[PDB]
Structure formats: C-alpha cells, structure tokens
Design a protein around this ligand. Structure first.
Ligand SMILES: CC(C)(C)c1cc(C(C)(C)C)c(O)c([C@@](O)(C(=O)O)C(F)(F)F)c1
Length: 134
C-alpha cells in the first residue's frame, strides 16, 4: 500500500528530447515516428489495491496497461509491438522492461521535484520526456 502515491494523478507532457532517435532504435517506422513524435500525451496513473493502471491519451493513440509489480504481462504498444512487460519499483523508480523478438527496452518513471520524468532507453539511445501535473 501507498507504494506509488507520488505517481498517482494526471500528467501532461511538457518537453521531449531524443524521442525520434529512441523510436528509430526501437524499430518504429517513419510514419508512426512522425505522428507519435507530434503527440502531446497525458499520462494518467492510478492505483487500486495491488493493481496499478497507466493510461496514455493523445491524438495518436489512447492506451492503457494494468499490472501488479513484478508480475509479467503481455502488452501491445502504441507502435503495435507485441511485447512481454514487467514493471517493478526500484528505489522509488518505476522500471518497465519490454521484451520482444530478442530485443529489450526499458522505460523508467520517476518523480523529480514537481515533475514526472520518463527515461526511455534502447541500447545506447536515451530519450527524456518530462511531464507536469495537468
Ligand atoms: C504517447 C506516445 C504514443 C507518443 C508514446 C509512444 C511510445 C512508443 C511509440 C511505443 C515508443 C512511447 O514509448 C511513449 C512513452 O514512452 C513516452 O511519453 O515516453 C510513454 F509510454 F511513457 F508514454 C509514448
């Protein structure tokens, strides 16, 4: 209980760096990269018991995942990858690993001051996405 209290809420993207390059490294195709890179998503995080729900809403796609920390699940990503995901809490950071086709990417979400900072890593390429409360 109260594991993720500081994450809960509705968040809006305010800045992005290197997202196109992250998407290229993941394998996202040109048209999706252009449209997704234009998106200004909200991220809506809630908790009910042990179940965490993360919704992403934008003009490109509306997605939702629900999960229990440490318990793998199957996810279809906004770029239509079918991945096996596990999300854990590591020293206060939500760490989301996605595995598919022998590849792996990690998305970290952390609270820093009044922001929720999202760091996406695919091999050597990192993208930093900053969200603020809506
Ligand atoms: C909202 C949207 C559709 C542009 C989006 C698309 C992707 C891809 C395409 C699967 C790489 C993605 O990874 C993320 C995200 O990582 C971010 O904001 O960085 C997440 F998940 F935190 F919302 C957002």
């Amino acid at each position: 209980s109260h594991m993720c209290d500081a994450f809960v809420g509705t968040w809006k993207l305010v800045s992005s760096e290197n997202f196109d390059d992250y998407m290229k490294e993941v394998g996202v195709g040109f048209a999706t990269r252009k449209v997704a890179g234009m998106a200004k998503p909200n991220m809506i995080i809630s908790v009910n018991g042990d179940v965490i729900t993360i919704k992403s809403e934008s003009t490109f796609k509306n997605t939702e995942i629900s999960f229990i920390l440490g318990q793998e699940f199957d996810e279809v990503t906004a770029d239509d990858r079918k991945v096996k995901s596990t999300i854990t809490l590591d020293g206060g950071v939500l760490v989301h690993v996605q595995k598919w086709d022998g590849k792996s990417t990690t998305i970290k979400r952390k609270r820093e001051d009044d922001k929720l900072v999202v760091e996406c890593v695919m091999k050597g390429v990192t993208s930093t996405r900053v969200y603020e409360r809506a």
